[PDB]
Design a protein around this ligand. Structure first.
Ligand code: HEM
Ligand SMILES: *[C@@H]1O[C@H](CO)[C@@H](O[C@@H]2O[C@H](CO)[C@@H](O)[C@H](O)[C@H]2NC(C)=O)[C@H](O)[C@H]1NC(C)=O
Ligand SMILES: [Ca+2]
Ligand SMILES: [Ca+2]
Length: 357
């Protein structure tokens, strides 16, 4: 088909997504893997995971836009704390680009946000999800204080995800920060490169913890290897769940398998996201509009490195059957501060709209 902007697309129905992508970039992302992007990416996951095979259809409809359609329900469950901001940012687009369902909008926005992150894969995008659904029940969202067994059961019950796929999805923590875990500090990154979709997160969770970026008594948080912060440049935070998955006999080797394996990580994540994006739907009934997803930003091609002040002696290995790669260490006597802004600055407020959530 040929869209009103001359763009040759696969199916005419995919044409509407073109103006939506540009609106999202101009209005809330500004072509950066920043704050707003990170929040949207998380919403994609929270919207999709709320579904249960065992409990049945009444428990939730998966990737159905329920977060946008019922803003006063799910966003208020304790496990969804902090999600309100992204819901309020997306609602205006739902109202404007009114030929696109809330469900499609959520998934597409995630694909767009991710494309702004260097190293990220170009996600598959299928459209056609219905604009009507029900509010999901509480308890379907995995929490940081959960055990590995519990986390794996949840993902299995949601859509038959295997342990490999679960760890694959956690690649998103390479461009993630925390605002609600510790209320005294904001934007605590999960790895030293929160604006780069690389394998640093997998390496840094394997290092020995030496302190906490804020308070020491927070549910779901464990000691961090890079706690030092100053001003807006908050220190690194480590979640119990990530730490646990990196050391459990069932997931230890899978976790290590991604260290310094950029292409393998990206491809595995794309595969897992392919499944997650259609939870609650039959993929044979959705149209393929992958060609309308923006081309992602390229990485530099550099391998993973031990951040300054850390080295091989700080590793807490758990996979007995695979050799840990030889990596270099970035020079320096002490820890470098992790920048709060992608342009290196320490001041960069993202656009935020007021809304019902
Ligand atoms: C395995 C279960 C998971 C747990 C327990 C978990 C937990 C968390 C927690 C506690 C935060 C911090 C939220 C805050 O306080 O602001 C977070 C952030 C985030 N997570 Fe997860 N997560 C999980 C899976 C995933 C998956 C599968 C994705 C995939 C899209 C994802 C994407 C994100 C992103 C992008 C952020 C950062 C948001 C921001 O920077 O504002 N997470 N996650
Ligand atoms: C999907 O459902 C939503 C929720 O009803 C629709 O949202 C309304 O859209 C109109 C414009 O068409 C706006 O004036 C309303 O303010 C929106 N309602 C809310 C609560 O925001 C949306 O139009 C529907 N989209 C499709 C494709 O069916
Ligand atoms: Ca949902
Ligand atoms: Ca990173």
């Amino acid at each position: 088909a040929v869209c009103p902007d001359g763009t040759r697309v696969s199916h005419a129905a995919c044409c509407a997504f073109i103006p939506l992508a540009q609106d999202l970039q101009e209005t809330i992302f500004q072509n950066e893997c920043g704050q707003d992007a990170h929040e949207v990416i998380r919403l994609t996951f929270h919207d999709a995971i709320a579904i249960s095979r065992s409990q049945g259809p009444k428990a939730g409809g998966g990737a159905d836009g329920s977060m946008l359609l019922f803003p006063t329900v799910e966003p208020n469950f304790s496990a969804n704390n902090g999600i309100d901001d992204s819901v309020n940012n997306l609602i205006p687009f739902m109202q404007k680009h009114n030929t696109i369902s809330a469900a499609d909008l959520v998934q597409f926005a995630g694909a767009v946000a991710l494309s702004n992150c260097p190293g990220a894969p170009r996600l598959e995008f299928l459209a056609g999800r219905p604009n009507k659904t029900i509010a999901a029940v509480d308890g379907l969202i995995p929490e940081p204080q959960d055990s590995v067994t519990k986390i794996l059961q949840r993902f299995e019950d949601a859509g038959g995800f295997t342990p490999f796929e679960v760890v694959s999805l956690l690649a998103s923590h390479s461009v993630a920060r925390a605002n609600k875990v510790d209320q005294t500090i904001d934007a605590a990154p999960f790895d030293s490169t929160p604006f780069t979709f690389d394998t640093q997160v997998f390496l840094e969770v394997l290092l020995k913890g030496v302190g906490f970026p804020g308070s020491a008594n927070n549910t779901g948080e464990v000691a961090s290897p890079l706690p030092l912060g100053s001003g807006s440049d908050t220190g690194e935070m480590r979640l119990q769940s990530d730490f646990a998955l990196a050391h459990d006999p069932r997931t230890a080797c899978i976790w290590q398998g991604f260290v310094n394996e950029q292409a393998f990580m990206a491809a595995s994540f794309r595969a897992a996201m392919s499944k997650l994006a259609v939870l609650g739907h039959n993929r044979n009934s959705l149209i393929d509009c992958s060609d309308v997803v923006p081309v992602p930003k390229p990485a530099t091609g550099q391998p993973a490195m031990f951040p300054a002040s850390t080295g091989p002696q700080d590793l807490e290995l758990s996979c007995p059957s695979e050799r840990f790669p030889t990596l270099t260490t970035q020079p320096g006597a002490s820890q470098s501060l992790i920048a709060h802004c992608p342009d290196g600055s320490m001041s960069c407020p993202g656009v935020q709209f007021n809304g019902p959530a």
